[PDB]
Design a protein around this ligand. Sequence first.
Ligand SMILES: O=[N+]([O-])c1cc(-c2ccnc(N3CCOCC3)n2)ccc1NCCCCCCN1C[C@H](O)[C@@H](O)[C@H](O)[C@H]1CO
Length: 765
Amino acid sequence: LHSEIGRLNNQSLLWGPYRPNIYFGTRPRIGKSLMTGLMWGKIESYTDFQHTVRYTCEQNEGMKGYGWDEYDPRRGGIQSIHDIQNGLDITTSFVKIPGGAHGGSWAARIKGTLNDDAPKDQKTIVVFYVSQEGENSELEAVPSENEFGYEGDVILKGRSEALGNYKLVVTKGKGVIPQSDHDLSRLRGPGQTVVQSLTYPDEVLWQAKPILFQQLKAGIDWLVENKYDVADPPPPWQVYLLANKPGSGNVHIVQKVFEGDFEFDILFSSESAGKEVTSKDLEREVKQATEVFGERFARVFDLKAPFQGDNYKKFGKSMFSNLIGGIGYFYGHSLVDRSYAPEYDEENEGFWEDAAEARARHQEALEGPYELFTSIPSRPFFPRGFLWDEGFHLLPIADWDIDLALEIIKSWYNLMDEDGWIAREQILGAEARSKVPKEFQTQYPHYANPPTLFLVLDNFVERLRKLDETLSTASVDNPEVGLEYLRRLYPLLRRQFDWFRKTQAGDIKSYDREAYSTKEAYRWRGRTVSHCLTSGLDDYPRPQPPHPGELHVDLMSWVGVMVKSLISIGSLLGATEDVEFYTKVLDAIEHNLDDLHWSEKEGCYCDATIDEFEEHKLVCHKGYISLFPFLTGLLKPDSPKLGKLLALIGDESELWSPYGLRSLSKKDEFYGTAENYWRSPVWININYLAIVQLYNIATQDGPYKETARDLYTRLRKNIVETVYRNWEETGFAWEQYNPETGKGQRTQHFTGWTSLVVKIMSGHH
Ligand SMILES: O=[N+]([O-])c1cc(-c2ccnc(N3CCOCC3)n2)ccc1NCCCCCCN1C[C@H](O)[C@@H](O)[C@H](O)[C@H]1CO
């Protein structure tokens, strides 16, 4: 029955607009298969279209905003795009229609409305680009009746082992098609939909922009060769209209030119499903998806006071939809240094210079291929899987669709190598690499990242203890199913736990270090003079200089998170030998957190280092790091150390701003210095952890119940209102928020863990 649920999930989730790196395109969760993408741009001159054309996501002055208004990966959704440069408000509606044996069918409506500013007679070029990778698969444009192109719909017939037979139709559409009175029209037609059918080696099919332009360039060269010149030039939009040449190939370019508003449909009909998809089906299925989205939202994200109003609902729907709508399918090779150079052990003083020298050996090589199905932080800036981010992303996604979350967890765990390592940044394939400078592609098998995916696992476990509708919760509703999923995943969790302890070990025994346990001590590998990227808090201040004797309290706390989850999951699976080992490790971390990391003088946890005199030293920098045992849920509700942490948390002159908790205290010598990334701004992911832990203490007997209740109330409100106020004014989720001004700063479109705000509003943790 677990096998059955699995197959049903695969069939449910196979198709999606799973190319979040581009404004709009679709691909199935198959590495080498059929992909589509949308391009559009105004044309006002003979040279502007290369500059106006839109394809890959960006964010600059020329784009007001864009995002999913509604989205569920099993059903589809609606995206809106506000393009200032091209004076167009665009909507792309995508819908899935289950049926047959190849993952069902789907349809999209693309609608473009000129805004008030655009010339009413604007010409907009629109391209639907279709490619298919695979050795024995085929795709063919059925030729038109007419001489120069298409008066009606464009029909592509294709086949592959993965998809069986299928047809993909690009409908005629509605809107004015400009007509040219030029002599050229006798050879190219007056103006009509055209198709070019081409083949390139499969591995370059993703390069849609270059492939299109090469065809446009061939067209213009033809004009030059055939005496079309500046004495009497055809209009721009006709100069840039491809000569129709439909056929067989692994690339199909479908081009339309419109004057004024336009719309057209794409209908993907899986042959194994019977009757083909129509535009009427599309309109009906779109109406249905919205009603279903609306109903699940009200149930799953029931916003509590004071955020129950419609403004907050719309805010919540926007934040949530952008998060789950960023889900992508990525496929390809990664760049990995598999030298395990000894310099990477970082055992000596000055280790960063040694590590730099090893990296300058450039032993890294491509490996894989790998696939990943994941949500992402940022469509415009880094549309790809990041390990600790995904733990935050799946917290709301799991609420919505636990089976989906587990699907993504499984996807990530399927990347884990033999040692227990998952690269913290997944850059899969040439297309993904294109967005990343080569110096930054290389992953290192000694680099960890927080195991936040365990948090998602923990929520699943408590839920396990206490058709698309049904599928979304199958793995909790059917406890046999849920448990089997854990059984299969459990060894990889255990492997990762072990990997952390082998590779991210700190050094107690080698120094004058007294502690309850001789084993429990941790140090993030990969630190440079100013950074610790692997911890996730890039430039939070750390002992200077970095040192093999460093110990990092955040990392120890993450191991505490892991072992607690392992206790839970081990228990469920009856792994008694494992549970008793975990039990002893937890007990040990509890004591060693105090013995190595507690500062009585400072009233908080500190990282530790080793003196010029070879003695243990605490290095306190009051901020997120300082609160880690509390953020990760390792402290008892009665703990006096907790009470001291609550005092720091609530203290306005340290961490507490009107807009959330500051990453670093205003009193810290490093406040607002250098790049000031994690040295003052308010970050939603860590504020979320604080909020959840305050609420835990607030809903339980203890000395700090009321304090925590008050801090919960205020921090929830502060965080929510800051993110809302910024969304209201700018339309964006931001990466972080200014604690002086409350302004969003760093990157826009960060959905992204900022979207946690929807779960904060929902409450009842
Ligand atoms: O590579 N870019 O395209 C790129 C572009 C821009 C940017 C900004 C404004 N404008 C422009 N313009 C137009 C576009 O191009 C450039 C010019 N660009 C900024 C950054 C990047 N890439 C940096 C990749 C590293 C991201 C780590 C983020 N997080 C760090 C957290 O600290 C960590 O915890 C967490 O896990 C991760 C993940 O969330």
